[PDB]
Write a protein that binds this DNA or RNA. Structure first.
Ligand code: MG
Ligand code: MG
Ligand code: MG
Ligand code: MG
Ligand code: MG
Ligand code: MG
Ligand code: MG
Ligand code: MG
Ligand code: MG
Ligand code: MG
Ligand code: MG
Ligand code: MG
Ligand code: MG
Ligand code: MG
Lengths: 128, 225, 125, 53, 147, 187
RNA sequence: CUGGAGCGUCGGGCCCAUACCCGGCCGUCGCCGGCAGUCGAGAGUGGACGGGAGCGGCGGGGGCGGCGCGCGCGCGCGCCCGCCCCCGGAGCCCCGCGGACGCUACGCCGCGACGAGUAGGAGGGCCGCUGCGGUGAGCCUUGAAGCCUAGGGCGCGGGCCCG
RNA sequence: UACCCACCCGACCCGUCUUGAAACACGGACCAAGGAGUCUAACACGUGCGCGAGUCGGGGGCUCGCACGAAAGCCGCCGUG
RNA sequence: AGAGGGCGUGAAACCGUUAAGAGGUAAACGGGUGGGGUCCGCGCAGUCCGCCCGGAGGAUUCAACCCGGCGGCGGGUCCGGCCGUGUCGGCGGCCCGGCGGAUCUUUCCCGCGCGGGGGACCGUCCCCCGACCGGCGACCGGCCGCCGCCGGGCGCAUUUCCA
């Protein structure tokens, strides 16, 4: 029963799946990472049928629900204590993410400050 | 001050409930020729064929002045002299339609694009359904919906055209301002013919769908509104 | 002038901070960490700030003087408020408004003060 | 291969500029090498117009 | 800088802003200003007309110092001399006319462009124009030569 | 299936100044302010110039601003220039003027003020006359730049006489295959 | 497969594309766009201020009507005379006395309209690598880089962020 | 969303030269690491900023053991061009 | 020592075995679901919170009011003074105000017609005071109006805390 949002809209995602690179499957030297294919002959790029789909714009996401975590609070990468008080007003629309490389002692310091002033933290219960 | 103003602005307020009544009334009684002419034009054509038939004798009704033209085929594999006409008729997209004023010049523009279009002399209920259901206007160069008729008056009030019904003389009867009536009017984008065509390719005359269909375009318009 | 400083300090600012699609401003007395004209501390010549009192309880309300700025030490004056939430806000409200002193912050200053107060009481079960 | 309006240009780099290029990162240390002469000569010839005859 | 170049935007871009039909081969035309008569002709003839050939007469060993001769236009003498030397006079009532060594300001010749203010002058110069003569005369004042 | 060319639907006008100079960006800001609002076309046009480039807001000479304000009717107005005023060493009876400019070269400054004129700036103008009432827009000659002589048809085409670009002019430096009719032909 | 599932000429009915319609959403261009603190929706002025007066008015077209009318001028109150008074208060859909939450003034908002692509261009890249000047009372032996992860996620994606 | 698996529809291997490639054309076993539009001079247009009938830049000078410095500052130089 | 003498880290191809699931159209791929797992959120009710209000319990001092103090804000009389913009006056700095000018005098002085210096002139920049005006974020003093804090008064149908 944590820190509810200001407003919880229906988040919709036009495609939920990743955009693998052509032949990232056969070859190990290819990372899944998109690289747009500029083959003269290549079937993908001539948007051919039942081939891998190409990442294009209009097949991107709603302005409101853009960038927005399943709960509602978009991240901030909070990185020490002082950076947390930035969200003190913008508490209820978006939350704290505590950076990977903060040391377990201040990883704690930040958390209980957050809860003090009611800012959600997505990894509150992490290093311990 | 306060209660010399209070009144002064309430007046303006009411001087409107005059005005937007007055006009509202005007429209309503305009709509009342727009019955009376609209009937009297029917009967007075029957009236007369009835008159002729009594003698051993014989009508030829007025040649049609109005013929909304539907484009019926797409836009690739298209000759030039055609494609230019089809974008003078504003039938750019496949299979929209416009209200065209027949006329030696216009008739003879349709000869030349015949194999791609389908026109006919449409009927009131056709004009209605079209202007009402699929009539947006061109306002600051924008397909904007005709929902209130302060949008028609706003472009055409200088031709004594003030309402959705005043448009609709100027679209049978041709009238003086066919031109400007039929050029705020933005080409009517019509859905696929429900129940389907006969043959996109050929003259109606040889069983197809193209060029002239006298009168019989009104089957076609029901199916495409 | 204000409007000018801004254009220097729009981007390029040490209390400015942009990660992760937000932008923000950690300066002393803006209210609500915004990057802005209205809600910025320094640029301008009259400024309301709201921040927690050093003791643990209450709210200090920082008001820029405008008697003589380019005088950082004294340019710029404070006051504690340890009361009972409602009067605490009514004080800030009456301090900003009916003192025609930047009646923009007006609400933000309240929202801050209100948010400060909730950060200081029996924290959690 | 010229294209549509320029000058002719006979840049003279058909020889071998590359080998015999003098760069000037002496310039400022030279400035100083010089300074110390102007300086020294004067202190040596003490009372005598530093500039010369 | 490297950062702000098209070559950055041409990676993954195979032929590199250069065409994969006819590649970027080394030196298709020739090398430099080469084929002026033959086949690059159409430039040289339409864009640099009058390149190919001799004309005129040699003057061989030549030195510019021999024929150094700058120009000034009447237009702006009433600059050369400090504007106060004009405001003094135009007034004064004796027909002073200040002297202007177009020499001393650096010009071996004075030429008749522009208006000249109605104001008598003594211009000492080298190689005067005719019109410069006439204008100065017709204003008032004189034309003195210098060697 | 719409059958328009998409070739030049996008218009190519400048819609912010390209510079980062805070003061231009401010008096630009000032008339996004006015030009939206007030009926006057003037401040649209001035807006539309603050906007434009150096090369394309050429400087006015003082002398040319004289013979554009000497004309009958134009007395008592303000000369207005989205650019710079410069001297004309070859002019002398400077009449008393009222000017606006982004810049005025320091020597023109002293010449105007000595005559008991005034100079304004693109803010004071906005208070003087926000609608542009009682003003005169002037620009320098945009077909001025020595560049513009290189422009046109070409040198070598028929009687269309256009500078060619030549490393150094002189006797031997383009006078031959195509200029003396004795030496091939001529155009 | 055979009065056929063959071939002529014809009906209805139905099936389906990335095509058209309506809607949804994400691009771009334009709107002489609005929005940097203001009235006002075929907008068809507003205001002094005087002299005179009042139920006057502006006693004009089957126009069907557009520019003049039936929510008021004057009036309720103070009592034929005065008023017709102040937002630090009218109580507010208009508010011009001061202005978004919204106004990173290269921010955000509404309209419409449109977004096949090799070569090429151009633009945009809080896309990515390494170096330095600034700056982040950045982070760090309470564990950095890398590395590893069928540990939650986010971007359309370069990648990015988290276990 | 990702792993395995299952099904239904779709479906030829990329790169390249190529009027036309899945090619009974050529490169290509796989993986790591390295790897290809760079610098300079000269033009030219476009644009940014300074000053403006000028404006500069050196090369020289005057001011450093440089920590920063082989910097910065300044010069009837400043115009000998 | 999962830093062991070619020893920091220690990837991929590649191979090592443990677990799960599959397996007649070579694998591998696109779209769509379904089953299962490893994990990940939870819930041993997730009934999510935040105002305001009414009711019933329980508890501190107030809020409304003045009075003493302190500190702001705003107003103006520009009242008084200080400040600067535009104008005028002082020709008053002008020699006790300089610097620029090929302006002018070798009536001057020094040094050798020239150089240096002095003296006259114009353009510039300072004092005196007087007058008008932008009276300007440039104050500072009094008078005011309002706000806030502190300290006094006000003991409880008030004003808070809690459930
Ligand atoms: Mg076809
Ligand atoms: Mg020497
Ligand atoms: Mg390409
Ligand atoms: Mg190639
Ligand atoms: Mg070829
Ligand atoms: Mg495209
Ligand atoms: Mg070949
Ligand atoms: Mg074959
Ligand atoms: Mg080969
Ligand atoms: Mg180890
Ligand atoms: Mg070590
Ligand atoms: Mg090891
Ligand atoms: Mg294994
Ligand atoms: Mg097994």
């Amino acid at each position: 029963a944590a820190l509810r949002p200001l407003v919880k809209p229906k988040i919709v995602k036009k495609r939920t799946k990743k955009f693998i690179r052509h032949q990232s499957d056969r070859y190990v030297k290819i990372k899944r990472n998109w690289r747009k294919p500029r083959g003269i002959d290549n079937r993908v790029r001539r948007r051919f049928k039942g081939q891998i789909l190409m990442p294009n714009i209009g097949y991107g996401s709603n302005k409101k629900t853009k960038h927005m975590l399943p709960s509602g609070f978009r991240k901030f990468l909070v990185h020490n204590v002082k950076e947390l008080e930035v969200l003190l007003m913008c508490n209820k629309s978006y939350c704290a993410e505590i950076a990977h490389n903060v040391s377990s002692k201040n990883r704690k310091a930040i958390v209980e400050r957050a809860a003090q002033l009611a800012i959600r933290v997505t990894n509150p219960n992490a290093r311990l | 001050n306060f209660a010399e103003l209070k009144i002064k602005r309430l007046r303006k307020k009411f001087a409107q409930k005059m005005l937007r009544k007055a006009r509202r009334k005007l429209i309503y009684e305009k709509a009342k020729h727009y019955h009376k002419e609209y009937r009297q034009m029917y009967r007075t054509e029957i009236r007369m064929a009835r008159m002729a038939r009594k003698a051993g004798n014989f009508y030829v009704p007025a040649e049609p002045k109005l013929a909304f033209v539907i484009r019926i085929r797409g836009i690739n594999g298209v000759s030039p002299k055609v494609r230019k006409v089809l974008q003078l008729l504003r039938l750019r997209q496949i299979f929209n339609g416009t209200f065209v004023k027949l006329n030696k010049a216009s008739i003879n523009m349709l000869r030349i694009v015949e194999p791609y279009i389908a026109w006919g002399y449409p009927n009131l209920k056709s004009v209605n359904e079209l202007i009402y259901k699929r009539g947006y206007g061109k306002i600051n160069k924008k397909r904007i919906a005709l929902t209130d008729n302060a949008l028609i008056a706003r472009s055409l009030g200088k031709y004594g055209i003030i309402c959705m019904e005043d448009l609709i003389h100027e679209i049978y009867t041709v009238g003086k301002r066919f031109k400007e009536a039929n050029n705020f009017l933005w080409p009517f984008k019509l859905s696929s013919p429900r129940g389907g065509m006969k043959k996109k390719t050929t003259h109606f005359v040889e069983g197809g769908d193209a060029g002239n269909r006298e009168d019989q375009i009104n089957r076609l318009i029901r199916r495409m509104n | 002038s204000a409007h000018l400083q801004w254009m220097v300090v729009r981007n390029c600012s040490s209390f400015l901070i942009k990660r992760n699609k937000q932008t923000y401003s950690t300066e002393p007395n803006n209210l609500k960490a915004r990057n802005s004209f209205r809600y910025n501390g320094l640029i301008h010549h009259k400024t309301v700030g709201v921040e927690p009192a050093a003791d643990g309880k209450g709210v200090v309300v920082v008001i820029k003087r405008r008697s003589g700025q380019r005088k950082p030490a004294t340019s710029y004056v404070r006051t504690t408020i340890n009361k009972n939430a409602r009067a605490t806000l009514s004080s800030i409200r009456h301090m900003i408004r009916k003192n025609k002193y930047r009646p923009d912050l007006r609400m933000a200053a309240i929202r801050r003060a209100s948010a400060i107060l909730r950060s200081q009481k029996p924290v959690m079960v | 291969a010229p294209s549509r309006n320029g000058m002719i240009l006979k840049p003279h780099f058909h020889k071998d500029w590359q080998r015999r290029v003098a760069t000037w990162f002496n310039q400022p240390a030279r400035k100083i090498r010089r300074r110390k002469a102007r300086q020294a000569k004067a202190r040596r010839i003490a009372p005598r117009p530093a500039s010369g005859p | 800088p490297s950062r702000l170049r098209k070559t950055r935007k041409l990676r993954g871009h195979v032929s590199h802003g250069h065409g994969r039909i006819g590649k970027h081969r080394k030196h298709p035309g020739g090398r430099g200003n080469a084929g002026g008569m033959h086949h690059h002709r159409i430039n040289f003839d339409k864009y640099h007309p009058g390149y190919f050939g001799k004309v005129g007469m040699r003057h061989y060993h030549l030195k510019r110092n021999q024929s150094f001769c700058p120009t000034v236009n009447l237009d702006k003498l009433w600059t050369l001399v400090s504007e106060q030397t004009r405001i003094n006079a135009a007034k004064n009532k004796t027909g002073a006319a200040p002297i202007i060594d177009v020499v001393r300001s650096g010009y071996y010749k004075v030429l008749g462009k522009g208006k000249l203010p109605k104001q008598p002058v003594i211009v000492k110069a080298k190689f005067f124009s005719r019109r410069a003569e006439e204008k100065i005369k017709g204003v008032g004042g004189a034309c003195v030569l210098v060697a | 299936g719409v059958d328009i060319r998409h070739n030049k639907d996008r218009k190519v006008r400048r819609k912010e100044p390209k510079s980062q100079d805070i003061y231009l960006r401010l008096l630009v800001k000032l008339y996004r302010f006015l030009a939206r609002r007030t009926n006057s076309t003037f401040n649209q046009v001035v807006l539309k110039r603050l906007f434009m480039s150096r090369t394309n807001r050429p400087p006015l000479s003082l002398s040319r601003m004289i013979r554009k304000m000497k004309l009958p009717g134009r007395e008592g107005k303000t000369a207005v220039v989205v650019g710079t005023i410069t001297d004309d060493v070859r002019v002398q009876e400077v009449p008393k003027l009222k000017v606006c400019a982004l810049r005025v070269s320091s020597r023109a400054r002293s010449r105007i003020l000595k005559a008991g004129g005034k100079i304004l700036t693109f803010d004071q103008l906005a208070l003087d006359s926000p609608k542009g009432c009682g003003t005169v827009l002037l620009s320098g000659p945009r077909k001025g730049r020595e560049v513009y002589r290189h422009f046109g048809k070409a040198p070598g085409t028929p009687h269309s006489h256009t500078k060619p670009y030549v490393r150094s002019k002189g006797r031997k430096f383009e006078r031959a295959r195509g200029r003396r009719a004795s030496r091939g032909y001529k155009n």
